[model samples]
Target chain A: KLVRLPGLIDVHVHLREPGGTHKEDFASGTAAALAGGITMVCAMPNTRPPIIDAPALALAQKLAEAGARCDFALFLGASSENAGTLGTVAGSAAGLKLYLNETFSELRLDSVVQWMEHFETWPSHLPIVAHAEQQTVAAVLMVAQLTQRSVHICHVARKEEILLIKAAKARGLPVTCEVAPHHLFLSHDDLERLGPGKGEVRPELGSRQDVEALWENMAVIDCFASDHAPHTLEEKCGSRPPPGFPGLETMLPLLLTAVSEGRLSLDDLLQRLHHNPRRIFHLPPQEDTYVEVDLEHEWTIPSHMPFSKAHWTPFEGQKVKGTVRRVVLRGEVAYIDGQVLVPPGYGQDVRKWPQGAVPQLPPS
Target chain B: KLVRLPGLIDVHVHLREPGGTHKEDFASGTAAALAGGITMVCAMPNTRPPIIDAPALALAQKLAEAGARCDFALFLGASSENAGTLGTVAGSAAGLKLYLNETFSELRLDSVVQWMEHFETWPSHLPIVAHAEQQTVAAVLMVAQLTQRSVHICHVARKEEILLIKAAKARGLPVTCEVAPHHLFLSHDDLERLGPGKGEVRPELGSRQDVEALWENMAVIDCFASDHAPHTLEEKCGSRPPPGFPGLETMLPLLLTAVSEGRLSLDDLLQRLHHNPRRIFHLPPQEDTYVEVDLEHEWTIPSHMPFSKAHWTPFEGQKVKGTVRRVVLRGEVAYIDGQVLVPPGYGQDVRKWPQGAVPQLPPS
Candidate 1:
């Protein structure tokens, strides 16, 4: 009933801090990640001050270093004003996050000139991750081709977007894309049940066909990101409920449920969640890090998760089969049996792994 | 800026008679049809008593003859037990409607043998309209190819369904399909605004991509049906809200809005609403029948339409440019400026047009 798999990595998540910690913070979000079998999460840069500069990036990194329960990386956000100097912070961040379309934060890039400036100046060593959607995806791919820099698109949902990414990949454009579990599992049809306010999400839940397209073209996808943007129930049900879902804790169980139903293979799951993410984000392999899951465990997702301050999930009553029982990090048990054994400061910055003289664990 | 158009035909509608007249009856339904600039309507057989055999067909026809305010035709419902006898009432009905998928009524045919029986026995002079969705469409097309009978698919929505229909049409399987305006305009995304109960619909609202696919493959569509299934607002908001919407009165203005937005052409509208429906359904030309429309008259669709008892529309506040000014049937003004000028019994059954000595309208 129990099996060991590499710790999953979610390359898209929002650890709301230095701005919106009331919804989610480094401590709670990273704990949620560990509970879902994710050992590493790459945070987006749409925070209050935004991670557009070294100072903003350092502030989040300092909070994360003090409280994060799991290894993490931060994306240095790209703004119209920071495009020229964004490359200077590449070594300190995971990648450059660009918003070509509407996002929950005030960080959308309206001009192609801004996109090209960021694409042209950002270091090629780290990927340029984009929150581009629909026609904006085609435009981003065009800019990627123009700049000849490998780009990683975040949270692709629609049929045209994924198919375009597939076409670009086939034509030798080094463009990779991620599919969120929410985008794969839920569509606008769910809005009826989730209610308009709670169901709100950016790149709004597309049609069922859009969900089917993601599944049908799974081969073209390089990562399975949670896009774990959490907001409180009060905020979500408010007059202007922000778009997004508390996704970190639900990603694996949802995918495992899909695996049980034969919709996805375990190998496909690992490639996207583990192997592909490590390669795409240039993440160091987590030494001695593995998650033990009870594949036969059957339970309903609760209305509230202790690890997230959001106090809600769009996946609130979903019956899932697999459950994360134990997560090991650096030869130490970090998360097991609904508890976090590690201290807040235990999570080492993934980029600082070599500098800290970390060693790979012996083979299983 | 008044222009004359051939009276539009809606080959799919539900009169809800003999059992659910509180929702709509032959009179109100037909009056709504005329108000939408439609002169002829082919009613589906999902009525309360269910129009499966000669008795039920005659019952609806009798009601239409007595109270209908516009030209109308009935569909002989096909059931497992009545497949052999469905042909007997074909002359009295417009076509044979087979519910190969889940329908609002209790007439779904679950077995392929039942389908083959109807396909093998139903006369080919009239078309076989089917409510086959997704993979069921493939099965229906297979039966059509095997039996060498042409099949008309009702409310084709998804990309897979439309593409499959297109492929079948290309392979010359004599398969045709219609896209309902609801399917073309509203998607599951609308469910958030419509609320769960009111958004309930059979085959369900597809994705935005599905909507785009229908538009992308408009050439594959042979007819534009309203699928004007109406239920009371109370019923829709009920715990067990039935699937469907009151679509008859909104079909024209919605399409005209699309035409004005340049998403659809007037020629395409005419082809699908008039030329195509006539050929596909074998509808007789109404002598001296024309609908006058003021294409520039902008108005909002009201929550309460006098012609329908359902008293609700999914398109309730949608602003539209074109409005039906007047309708002339048999050289007589039948409906003008939101009023039904003709008496209930004035409307004749389209199947009996020739027998009634109706003549084609003089050249416009």
Candidate 2:
């Protein structure tokens, strides 16, 4: 028995759809997630034309349900144009997302603050996940002051910034933070070496010291999110590719290696991969969904193993010390023995909040 | 007009000699250094049969002087069998190199301590450089206690160990440290994405926090040596290739970009690249040597552009914002306008420990 834990949940990922399918679509992205033993992923709203409103969110839900090979959830975008649609989209969303950086749209600080204020009046207690960085930390602080709802800081990288986040947390702010696997492992120096090929992420790699501080502050981080934004090598190496590294296929093996190396304990891995995400997203306890990983099985990662359309993986040709043998979703083996056992549509869409929970707004 | 500065002097590089020419040799390695605006490089003594005595050191010097494209110096190795040879080797070398971790020979801590004691009585005030890591930090401390001489800690990577080094410095122990360009920029997290192609090095790429702390303490680092050990892609990506990155070609542009991005300043770059190396290695001042960099020019690094026979460079295909325009050595343009102009015999063999310095021998 490989100590089968609850299925993993990733609340941050980019499955390019309604456009950019040549890189990764709902089908391919979900397939990769299944291969990596991820049970569910909360898709970001930065798709083609952006999934900002109710119709877009519903369309994404339909496509994911039809084409996705794994469980999924959707995040509604809160841009200036879509601020009015929060209530409409909240019915099907895990939470509202505000792009503090101008990564997708003109979701500037003012617009995010405005949406935060309005979102505080929603009937449901929806969390606001902010993509925090030095350029947008002040705006995150400002939004923190105005909203009583929980705010999750995504992908905390720099050591100095992690200290700042700690200070904010100490101030009794209802804030949670996420550390990406890439941020924990790679530094700005690695990015410089990888250049355009493996180095496609914003706020780029920080120094070795920054990574050390990040590891030191793992207790403060609420969960580890993959932020699995897939892109073709041509697009990733193209003139106008968005900054991100594909994490769906590499996350589990890398995390298991961390456990094996003693950088992170197996308990911490379980908390971040399953328990924390469930607690943060208010997911219900399901006995049937689980992921089984063999900690002792040694495996080498081959290039071109990703199920996603994106051919390039930063972990290409690396050997991982552990292996994932099987993934069971709703008591059915979704992945087993290095092959996907379940057919498409075997996985279902996870509900936004746990069943039978009252939809109450956070106290303003 | 571009604020020409003294060309960089890297005191730690492995230009594989006497063997492994297919990976990297004196000619190609020196050419790469010239391309990166480095005027002088101190080659490590871990070559075939090792440069442990005066005969070997003299042979290496003769070869470098006759064939190397850039000025070069050699470090003498300290081992149990060659402990008596240290005096002879140090007479012509810059310093004695004690391998804390096994590089070429089977020199361990006890033998290293004995060799350090022998060097303590030598007439020359030659420095001892240790390749410090977890496996060797204890050995280095022991050698420091025995030698009572200044030791340059080579390629400090781990964040916690750097703090330990800082404590050693503060305690008035004769200790200085150097950081590699790759260590300063990349984190352990980056390794997961890089997989096996990233290659293994001692004191593996640390967390982002570790890298950031190194950058914060940049003032304390005596020099920024590249440790440019190139290996063929097959060897580097092989099952058990030694850990290192090809850095000689990418050092300048990466640092220039860092300066441009405000992470570092021009003065800091110059200090690490030139002033500090000169001070630590006790090299004669070359007032006529200069390297000019074009900060505004963009150069797309090609996959096989590296002058070294090594098939891969970590910085391959990166579009660096700055370019090394020209390198002048002793009033002559060694490399100019994207081409190496100097012939093979133009470079000289730099003698270690300055001119007229005699090695001190232990009492019988």
Best of the candidates, lDDT: 1
All candidates' lDDT scores? 0.83, 0.73
What are the DockQ scores of the candidates, in order?
0.01, 0.01
**Residues A151-251 of candidate 2: C-alpha lDDT, one tens digit per residue:** 77888888756765575566566778788878886777666556765687865777898899988988888889888877777777778766878888888
Stretches off by above 4 angstroms in model 1 are A355-364, B1-364
On the 0 to 100 scale, the lDDT of residue B265 in model 1 is: 92
Model 2 C-alpha lDDT per residue in residues B162-192, reported as the tens digit of each score: 6656655665667777888888767776666
Clashes of 2: 38
* iRMS, all models: 17.4, 21.2
TM-scores for all predictions: 0.51, 0.49
Q: Is the docking of candidate 2 incorrect, acceptable, medium or high quality?
A: incorrect
TM-score of chain A of each: 0.95, 0.91
Q: Per-residue error at A306 for model 2, in Å?
A: 2.7
**Pairs that collide, model 1:** A207-B207, B287-B359, B288-B361
Error of 2 at B6 (Å): 60
Candidate 2: where are CA atoms >4 Å away?
A104-124, A352-364, B1-364
